[PDB]
Amino acid sequence: MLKIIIPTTMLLPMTWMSKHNMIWINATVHSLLISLISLSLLNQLGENSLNFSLTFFSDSLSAPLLVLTTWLLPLMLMASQSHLSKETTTRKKLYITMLILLQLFLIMTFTATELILFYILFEATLVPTLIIITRWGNQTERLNAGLYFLFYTLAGSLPLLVALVYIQNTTGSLNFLIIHYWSHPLSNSWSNIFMWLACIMAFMVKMPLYGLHLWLPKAHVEAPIAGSMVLAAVLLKLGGYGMMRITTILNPLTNYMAYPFLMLSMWGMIMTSSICLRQTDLKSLIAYSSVSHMALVIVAIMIQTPWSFMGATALMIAHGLTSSMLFCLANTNYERVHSRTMILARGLQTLLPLMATWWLMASLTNLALPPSINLIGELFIITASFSWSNITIILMGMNMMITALYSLYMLITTQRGKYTHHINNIKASFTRENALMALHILPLLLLTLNPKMILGPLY
Amino acid sequence: PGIVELPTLEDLKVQEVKVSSSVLKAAAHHYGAQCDKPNKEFMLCRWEEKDPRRCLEEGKLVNQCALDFFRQIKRHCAEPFTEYWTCIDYSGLQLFRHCRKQQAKFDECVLDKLGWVRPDLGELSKVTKVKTDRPLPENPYHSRARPEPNPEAEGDLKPAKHGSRLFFWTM
Numbered sequence: 001m002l003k004i005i006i007p008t009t010m011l012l013p014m015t016w017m018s019k020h021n022m023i024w025i026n027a028t029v030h031s032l033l034i035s036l037i038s039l040s041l042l043n044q045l046g047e048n049s050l051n052f053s054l055t056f057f058s059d060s061l062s063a064p065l066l067v068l069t070t071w072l073l074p075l076m077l078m079a080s081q082s083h084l085s086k087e088t089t090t091r092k093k094l095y096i097t098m099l100i101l102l103q104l105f106l107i108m109t110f111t112a113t114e115l116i117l118f119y120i121l122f123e124a125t126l127v128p129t130l131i132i133i134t135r136w137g138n139q140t141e142r143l144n145a146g147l148y149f150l151f152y153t154l155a156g157s158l159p160l161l162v163a164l165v166y167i168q169n170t171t172g173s174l175n176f177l178i179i180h181y182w183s184h185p186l187s188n189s190w191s192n193i194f195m196w197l198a199c200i201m202a203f204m205v206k207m208p209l210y211g212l213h214l215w216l217p218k219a220h221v222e223a224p225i226a227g228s229m230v231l232a233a234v235l236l237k238l239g240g241y242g243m244m245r246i247t248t249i250l251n252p253l254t255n256y257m258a259y260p261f262l263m264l265s266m267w268g269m270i271m272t273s274s275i276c277l278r279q280t281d282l283k284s285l286i287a288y289s290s291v292s293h294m295a296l297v298i299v300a301i302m303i304q305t306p307w308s309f310m311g312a313t314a315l316m317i318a319h320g321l322t323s324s325m326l327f328c329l330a331n332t333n334y335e336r337v338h339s340r341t342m343i344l345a346r347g348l349q350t351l352l353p354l355m356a357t358w359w360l361m362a363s364l365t366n367l368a369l370p371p372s373i374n375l376i377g378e379l380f381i382i383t384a385s386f387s388w389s390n391i392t393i394i395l396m397g398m399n400m401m402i403t404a405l406y407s408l409y410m411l412i413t414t415q416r417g418k419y420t421h422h423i424n425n426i427k428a429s430f431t432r433e434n435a436l437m438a439l440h441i442l443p444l445l446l447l448t449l450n451p452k453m454i455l456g457p458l459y
Numbered sequence: 460p461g462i463v464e465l466p467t468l469e470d471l472k473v474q475e476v477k478v479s480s481s482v483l484k485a486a487a488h489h490y491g492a493q494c495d496k497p498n499k500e501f502m503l504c505r506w507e508e509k510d511p512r513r514c515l516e517e518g519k520l521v522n523q524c525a526l527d528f529f530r531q532i533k534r535h536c537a538e539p540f541t542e543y544w545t546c547i548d549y550s551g552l553q554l555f556r557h558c559r560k561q562q563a564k565f566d567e568c569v570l571d572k573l574g575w576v577r578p579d580l581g582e583l584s585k586v587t588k589v590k591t592d593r594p595l596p597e598n599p600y601h602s603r604a605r606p607e608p609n610p611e612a613e614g615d616l617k618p619a620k621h622g623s624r625l626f627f628w629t630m
Contacts, residue, residue, distance in 0.1 A: 114627045
């Protein structure tokens with residue numbers, strides 16, 4: 001993985017010494033070649049995970065997420081120099097450095113072999129995101145955002161650390177391959193119940209589960225766009241990925257304690273969706289939609305069914321792409337209006353036809369229009385849940401319904417109407433954002449064409 | 460838990476030489492010269508055995524020899540010794556410094572009546588070698604068996620198997 005790690009690390013000196021004008025160009029292009037190199041990592045052996053070294057390995061679950069992060073890295077670079085144009089060169093270089101360190105930590109996380117190293121980099125993603133959210137944020141509760149986000153993450157992270165070190169003392173090693181091959185049945189002891197809770201609740205905090213999901217409507221809504229997309233697209237996937245890794249040594253106990261959280265998500269995905277309907281801000285609506293989709297992924301994880309795992313992975317990838325695109329579109333409109341209430345600027349479909357389209361298939365993919373990978377990922381989870389329990393369907397059946405409502409509602413109330421007369425700053429569509437939504441959208445349908453890649457390790 | 464063995468009153472029924480401390484001090488040097496063998500044997504027994512309940516017979520024999528010495532000095536040089544020890548007894552600190560003439564009379568009397576000479580300065584404080592015939596106490600302190608020493612650490616050292624073996628650090 002050092003064919004991807006070493007270039008990512010060496011990307012830091014390039015930006016840190018590039019001229020006052022070349023930082024954006026150089027970072028964008030070289031991150032694009034980094035994504036190209038990581039495109040190779042989609043090469044997967046039939047059943048054996050690709051073990052590059054002792055400390056680094058990859059399989060059909062880590063590789064798609066890694067490719068997602070590496071391909072994403074140019075996208076924040078393209079979305080940031082709009083709101084980062086009027087800044088000192090050193091400050092811009094550090095913003096870029098925060099982004100590269102974030103991507104590097106995500107790569108080491110996804111390619112980590114020992115659970116402790118996975119925890120180290122997984123949590124270590126907090127710091128660059130914290131700096132991005134706090135310093136470069138524009139709204140008020142950004143300072144409150146950082147506190148909420150850090151403390152919510154850590155409150156689950158530390159018990160996970162205690163559980164992992166206890167596992168190391170008892171089992172012998174935290175290596176994934178060992179704990180899977182040398183896996184042993186888990187007894188229904190209450191100490192084992194608390195161990196399962198410690199191993200689960202950190203990822204479920206970052207999932208998020210309903211109830212303890214307040215860090216997203218107070219974090220993604222406030223972060224700069226680059227931070228917002230890197231949060232929603234991948235950082236949410238950290239908990240799902242960790243759960244998929246950890247349920248190997250968390251059975252057969254899970255089912256007995258699967259009952260509270262599963263429905264907590266199942267019911268929660270309704271409320272969040274309902275919360276999406278009666279929203280006032282675009283970014284908050286997208287954040288709550290992300291919460292609902294991630295709750296569906298939670299249900300997929302706790303079913304522990306092959307089909308559930310494949311649908312889960314597909315939903316993570318598709319949701320990352322769709323949420324990043326929706327946040328980018330919201331930023332474009334907000335910057336054009338310097339406000340975020342989704343009533344101030346409506347009826348812009350005529351003014352910006354390409355934005356009107358980009359919003360149209362962004363909503364369609366968010367609404368999971370078949371045969372997009374969003375729809376197949378959702379439907380696989382629906383079928384797995386129905387096999388696990390029939391009634392789930394109606395709740396599932398409710399979700400996209402309400403989702404569809406808001407999935408079109410903002411499009412009705414932001415572009416499908418009459419323009420506001422007193423505003424005039426809406427200029428011609430700068431081709432930067434249009435191109436950015438292109439690099440968002442075309443890979444989505446490309447993966448729709450061949451979903452065997454994002455299908456996960458169960459395929 | 461045990462027995463505090465004590466020799467019965469019959470063994471320690473010595474003749475109990477009875478002279479005052481001044482009388483003892485007056486005849487100190489000559490007694491040390493002409494009675495060194497019993498004192499030395501008894502003290503070597505005391506220091507070696509470290510048990511006064513064992514060397515009681517040497518305590519008898521030293522008193523016997525001391526009484527013999529005093530009987531001889533009574534029989535041959537009674538008057539000069541009496542005057543010398545009285546003059547020693549007058550002093551509060553019992554110093555030989557004030558009483559030198561009587562010391563001279565006593566010394567010449569015992570020299571020409573019992574063939575004695577006073578030890579020179581420091582002669583009576585030299586470590587002597589005794590020819591006692593008792594065995595050497597194998598365990599004077601009655602020490603029990605010592606605990607076995609911890610297993611000695613030995614052997615060639617090779618690199619630690621698989622490095623530090625501390626989490627993900629392979630090397």
